[PDB]
Design a protein around this ligand. Structure first.
Ligand SMILES: [Zn+2]
Length: 37
């Protein structure tokens, strides 16, 4: 439960891909979903 992002999986915004350690997940979005501005 309530913890320092130890026991919690975050889901992707674009797709429904969730993986532990959201900290790293951030990359996926950029990789799998490389958007430009
Ligand atoms: Zn994704």
């Amino acid at each position: 439960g309530s913890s320092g992002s130890s026991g919690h999986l975050y889901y992707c915004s674009q797709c429904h891909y969730s993986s532990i350690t959201k900290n790293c997940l951030k990359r996926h979005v950029i990789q799998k979903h490389s958007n430009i501005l």
